[PDB]
Design a protein around this ligand. Structure first.
Ligand SMILES: Cc1cc2nc3c(=O)[nH]c(=O)nc-3n(C[C@H](O)[C@H](O)[C@H](O)COP(=O)(O)O)c2cc1C
Length: 362
């Protein structure tokens, strides 16, 4: 077994290869999109993970698409996250913040000024996001048609990612993960399905990847390349965003570009919850020969699949999502071959302590 052996992940050293995937739980305070001590307890419980990757966190107020998702743009958010990272560190853990802009997976009622959310193009996502009702409970609501960003707004978006990384470093995170997956803003630019722009940020794959690579360069310059990871979902369809008619070649272009920056890791979200065609071993080989940082695989993994792919030299670590919701001590359980706690999906999104901090250890 290799899952319980250490791994260098850029600037930090993980003691095992069992990572906690980013998981939106929608329990932040409004007004202010503020993380809470309850969230701190949840993360502290999971500090034995090789690496915790936080729930997706707004780079700006405009970035918000979900009621209850936290930000990392305000002083109060910075202060609250500082307490959370300190608690994880007190338990000898490591924590990355996943930073997003939701783009068109959003609703005008939670945008600044009540305005339409932004995207690469003015095309509805044709999905739902999660808002809160008058009692503060999570509700699913159809997405608002977005406004296409003007060319002169793009530097501001890059600056918002840069600023959020400055804030993340101050807040005590060990790494940052850019959310370039799952149909959110960066992926909206990457995908031809969502990007119909005819300027330097659409058309060719070079142009479609331009924004994400500008963001990568800005955040590497703000902090250091060995502090930066990126999550992609570049094969298949996620939240109605496919990867276009040349998805493999386009993915390999992006990955070769990322490699040039010497970033800490590439995190591949392989499938959504409904599943789909597995990655071919040939594709995994092509990725591996092009990227020289850590590769994290995710999406309905088992420990056995992770060991197989680590043993084949194709990935370095695995991120578990739902098994981490339900098993704070997932590392110990997988090491000991213990049963896993029963998941309670009704409490994944929103609410309070129940279904959040009340899953037991062994
Ligand atoms: C409740 C829930 C929230 C999620 N939130 C995020 C998120 O904030 N960022 C992200 O990149 N993926 C998110 N995902 C995807 C997970 O990180 C993970 O890739 C997915 O659940 C599949 O892995 P699993 O089979 O181990 O759960 C979420 C998944 C679930 C079930």
């Amino acid at each position: 077994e290799k899952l319980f052996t250490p791994l260098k992940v850029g600037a930090v050293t993980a003691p095992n290869r069992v990572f906690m995937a980013p998981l939106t739980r929608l329990r932040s305070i409004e007004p202010g999109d503020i993380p809470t001590p309850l969230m701190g307890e949840y993360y502290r419980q999971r500090a034995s993970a090789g690496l915790i990757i936080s729930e997706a966190t707004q780079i700006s107020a405009q970035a918000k698409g979900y009621a209850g998702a936290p930000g990392l743009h305000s002083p109060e958010q910075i202060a609250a996250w500082k307490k959370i990272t300190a608690g994880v560190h007190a338990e000898d853990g490591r924590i990355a913040v996943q930073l997003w802009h939701t783009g068109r997976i959003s609703h005008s009622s939670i945008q600044p000024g009540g305005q339409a959310p932004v995207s690469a193009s003015a095309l509805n996502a044709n999905t739902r996001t999660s808002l809160r009702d008058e009692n503060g409970n999570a509700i699913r609501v159809d997405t608002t048609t977005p406004r296409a960003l003007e060319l002169d707004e793009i530097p501001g978006i890059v600056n918002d990612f840069r600023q959020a990384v400055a804030n993340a470093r101050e807040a005590g995170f060990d790494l940052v993960e850019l959310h370039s997956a799952h149909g959110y803003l960066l992926h909206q630019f990457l995908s031809p399905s969502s990007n119909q722009r005819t300027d330097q940020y659409g058309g060719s794959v070079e142009n479609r990847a331009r924004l994400v690579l500008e963001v990568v360069d800005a955040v590497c310059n703000e902090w250091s390349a060995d502090r930066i990871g990126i999550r992609v979902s570049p094969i298949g369809t996620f939240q109605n965003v496919d990867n276009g008619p040349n998805e493999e070649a386009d993915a390999l272009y992006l990955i070769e570009e990322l490699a040039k920056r010497g970033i800490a890791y590439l995190h591949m979200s392989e499938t959504d919850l409904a599943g789909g065609k597995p990655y071919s071993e040939a594709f995994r080989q092509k990725v591996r020969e092009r990227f020289h940082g850590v590769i994290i695989g995710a999406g309905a993994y088992t420990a056995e699949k992770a060991e197989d792919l680590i043993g084949k030299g194709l990935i370095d670590a695995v991120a578990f999502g739902r098994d981490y919701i339900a098993n704070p001590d997932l590392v110990a359980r997988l090491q000991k071959k213990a049963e896993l706690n029963p998941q309670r999906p009704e409490s994944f999104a929103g609410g309070g302590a129940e279904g959040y901090t009340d899953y037991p250890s062994l």
